[PDB]
Design a protein around this ligand. Structure first.
Ligand SMILES: NC[C@@H]1O[C@H](O[C@H]2[C@@H](O)[C@H](O[C@@H]3[C@@H](O)[C@H](N)C[C@H](N)[C@H]3O[C@H]3O[C@H](CO)[C@@H](O)[C@H](O)[C@H]3N)O[C@@H]2CO)[C@H](N)[C@@H](O)[C@@H]1O
Ligand SMILES: [Mg+2]
Ligand SMILES: [Mg+2]
Ligand SMILES: [Mg+2]
Ligand SMILES: [Mg+2]
Ligand SMILES: [Mg+2]
Ligand SMILES: [Mg+2]
Lengths: 142, 88, 182, 220
RNA sequence: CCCAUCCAAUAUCGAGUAACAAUUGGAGGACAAGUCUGGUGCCAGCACCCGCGGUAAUUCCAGCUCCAAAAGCGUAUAUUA
RNA sequence: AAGUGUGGAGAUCGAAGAUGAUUAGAGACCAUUGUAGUCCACACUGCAAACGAUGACACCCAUGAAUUGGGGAU
RNA sequence: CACCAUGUUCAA
């Protein structure tokens, strides 16, 4: 009950497939422009921003902590986002009005497990790497 | 001369299996309903000889109910069982 | 920018990086042949994979086809030339049976161990890389040098090496200077 | 010792049935695992456990727990058998699956892809086998391919004597209880397909229990 | 410049802790590799996913010891399988 | 089916609403009512678990009770 | 066929 044969039925099969590829959430995201115009990074990776304020986001059930994260405002398009600060400590390396280099983390913008509504991640603060500051490879300028 | 060969003419496979005499169906090793039935060849005085006619039937054919129709069709062909009365 | 010199990749990393059966075989191959890293095994995989793939294409082709007489007599020629197959093996179905230790036996690190010029396979890799073995009066400093069959007769010490007919090496020579100032 | 109860095991112990293909010919159930290790040589018969996983039964006051063990057995020359038993201790169910895997021993037809030149490297035709939703399909491969399969069918296809094969798997293969028994059902179908080699008429034989009926009555 | 050749051709400097010192990610599972010791006590943090952490943590912070790839190795975003 | 428009009809049941009662509360179930509706004509709507949760047209397909309409034998 | 509503968060 599914599809058509016929030696001259190729226009039917070409039209049939081009509409059913829009139902694929990978094909539709790769071929519509709401994907990049609403992505806070401009269809790119690692956008810079300025730290505005520090937030403690409480973990989801069944976990219980508060996740240390900053809210930053990106430079390329002035979009306010909340981004996580990975490691033990590490808001001690971030002050307000710091330029931070913010990547996503994990899952193509889908909020890695415990943290609710945070889908970006601090990589580098004041143009020195944030994991290099944790392991004390080098220290902050100024 | 049955079973696959080598291009050197040695019989490569183990176990050439039986085939159903009704349906020509190759009898598998786990087909535990498949039976052989040996029918005694008998002589002119009505006493059995030392030779028997053996016919083997596959297991699905017995499962349906169609084996008894197949034993008739075989033994008419082999000449074992007569198809009708003689004329009075 | 307008440079047309070519380059490709010679090895490939395996799918499934943690297979306990595969990781045990390759540590045996790093020990029995004195190898630096798993990547030297992995190019011997790709070298043999490409032979195993072309020779499996040619058997799809019939005999008395042009691409099987030519180029099927080339792949049997380079197996016989480099010692991958002895001269009895001539049917092209033996390239499909070659293994990674069949290729690793033809490295200059292995023959210098097998000919007897070194005590261990880690003695052989030092003496190649420290400029002691000449294949045809040609100092070869490459351990992955695949030795041909005709080259086996002529592997010896280098004529410039201290172990051959050359000047004495460093520890004798810097000691011969210290006995000279006195 | 081992005293047999079935007539087949009486004839195996008496060396009246000499090989295992004399049982496969007459479709006889084995019913005694001492038949198999008698007929197959002891060093030429390999076994190892495929999977062990626990299955639980909700009861009043908690769960009951028994371990379901999968074993595969076979020399790598066309005999394969898989058995799945369960038990309270993990050591009992491993031992019971060894007993079970020998009872399910079954032959594998092997053949050629292209020309015929030696021992058969592959299965003689495309065959699928289905248990649950998991159906594996086994396709003949050329002479130097290897077994191209997932590592649970690949270990079964090594023990069955198949040297080069292509393999697909259609659905929920992470269920290994049905993935194991679908590779077994597919290799079991290799003597079910009627090829024009086997078109010829073969002369009928006599059952080992037909022929040796006078000897078996002397055990009573 | 580099590489290559050379430490006499009468006559050329040089390894030892070869200190001339390998790193990057891991050790519950997938996924290779600790029922080790110290600390913290649903905190701090880890965790792609499943999950860890509530005073005996196989998962955090560390020391040891191992595993993996190795002059490399993590991470992020695209993209093919 | 509910709903809408214009005319009829208006017996009974009855969304809304009104009284009783139950209840911690009762805006509900239960009792008494009662408007729109129910019913017809002519227009409009086109929203169902509009179901067999099974698209249409062909093909092959084992068995035994029955059943509806047509035809044929006794 | 009177009335009969509810039981914090993880974990075992
Ligand atoms: N979810 C984030 C994932 O991260 C990936 O990002 C990268 C890495 O995480 C990943 O690195 C993997 C490494 O994790 C894994 N342990 C081993 C693997 N060899 C690495 O792969 C990388 O390194 C090798 C060098 O051998 C390169 O040759 C190879 O091209 C490269 N992909 O390869 C990717 C290349 O940088 C994917 N880009 C991304 O699509 C995916 O979503
Ligand atoms: Mg020199
Ligand atoms: Mg501890
Ligand atoms: Mg640790
Ligand atoms: Mg009441
Ligand atoms: Mg009323
Ligand atoms: Mg309440």
């Amino acid at each position: 009950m599914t599809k058509t044969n016929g030696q001259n039925a190729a226009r039917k099969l070409v039209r049939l497939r081009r509409r059913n590829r829009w139902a694929d959430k990978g094909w539709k995201r790769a071929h519509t422009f709401a994907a990049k115009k609403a992505n806070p990074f401009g269809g790119s990776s690692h956008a810079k921003g300025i730290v505005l304020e520090k937030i403690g986001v409480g973990a989801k059930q069944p976990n219980s902590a508060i996740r240390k994260c900053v809210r930053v405002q990106l430079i390329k398009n002035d979009k306010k986002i909340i981004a996580f600060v990975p490691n033990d400590g590490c808001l001690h390396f971030i002050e307000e009005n710091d330029e931070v280099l913010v990547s996503g983390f994990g899952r193509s913008g889908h909020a890695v497990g415990d943290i609710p509504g945070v889908r970006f991640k601090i990589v580098k603060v004041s143009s020195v790497g944030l994991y290099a500051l944790y392991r004390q490879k080098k220290e902050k300028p100024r | 001369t049955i079973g696959m060969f080598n291009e050197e003419g040695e019989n490569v496979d183990l176990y050439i299996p039986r085939k159903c005499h009704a349906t020509n169906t190759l009898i598998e090793a786990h087909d535990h309903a498949a039976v052989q039935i040996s029918i005694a060849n008998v002589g002119p005085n009505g006493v059995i000889n030392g030779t028997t006619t053996t016919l083997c039937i596959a297991g699905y054919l017995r499962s349906q109910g169609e084996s008894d129709h197949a034993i008739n069709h075989i033994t008419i062909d082999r000449g074992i069982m007569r198809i009708k009365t003689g004329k009075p | 920018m307008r440079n047309y010199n070519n380059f490709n990749r010679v090895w490939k990393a395996p799918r499934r990086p943690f297979e306990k059966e595969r990781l045990d075989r390759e540590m045996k191959l790093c020990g029995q042949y004195g190898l630096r890293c798993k990547r030297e095994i992995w190019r011997v995989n790709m070298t043999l994979s490409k032979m195993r793939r072309t020779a499996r294409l040619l058997l799809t082709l019939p005999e008395n086809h042009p691409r099987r007489l030519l180029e099927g007599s080339a792949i049997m020629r380079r197996c016989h030339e480099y010692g991958f197959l002895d001269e009895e093996k001539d049917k092209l179905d033996y390239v499909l049976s070659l293994t990674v230790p069949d290729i690793l036996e033809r490295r200059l690190q292995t023959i210098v161990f097998k000919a007897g010029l070194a005590k261990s396979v880690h003695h052989a890799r030092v003496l190649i890389q420290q400029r002691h073995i000449a294949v045809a009066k040609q100092i070869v400093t490459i351990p992955s040098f695949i030795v041909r069959v005709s080259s086996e007769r002529h592997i010896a010490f280098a004529d410039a090496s201290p172990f051959g007919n050359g000047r004495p090496g460093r520890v004798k020579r810097v000691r011969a200077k210290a006995a000279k100032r006195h | 010792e081992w005293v047999p109860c079935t007539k087949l095991g009486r004839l195996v112990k008496a060396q009246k049935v000499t090989s295992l293909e004399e049982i496969f010919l007459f479709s006889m159930p084995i019913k005694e695992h001492q038949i198999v290790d008698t007929l197959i040589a002891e060093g030429q018969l390999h076994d190892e456990m495929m999977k062990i996983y626990p299955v639980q039964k909700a009861t009043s006051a908690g769960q009951r727990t028994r371990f379901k063990a999968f074993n595969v057995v076979g020399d790598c020359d066309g005999h394969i058998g898989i058995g799945a038993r369960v038990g309270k201790e993990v050591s009992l169910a491993i031992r019971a699956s060894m007993i079970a895997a020998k009872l399910n021993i079954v032959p594998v037809r092997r053949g050629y892809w292209g020309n015929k030149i030696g021992e058969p490297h592959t299965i003689p035709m495309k065959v699928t086998g289905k248990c649950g939703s998991v159906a594996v399909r086994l396709v003949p491969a050329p002479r130097g391919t290897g077994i191209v399969a997932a590592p649970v069918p690949k270990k079964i296809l090594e023990f069955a004597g198949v040297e080069d094969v292509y393999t697909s798997s259609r659905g929920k293969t992470r269920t290994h209880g049905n993935l194991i028994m679908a590779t077994f059902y597919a290799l079991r179908k290799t003597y079910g397909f009627l090829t024009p080699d086997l078109w010829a008429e073969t002369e009928p034989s006599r059952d080992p229990t037909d022929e040796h009926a006078e000897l078996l009555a002397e055990m009573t």
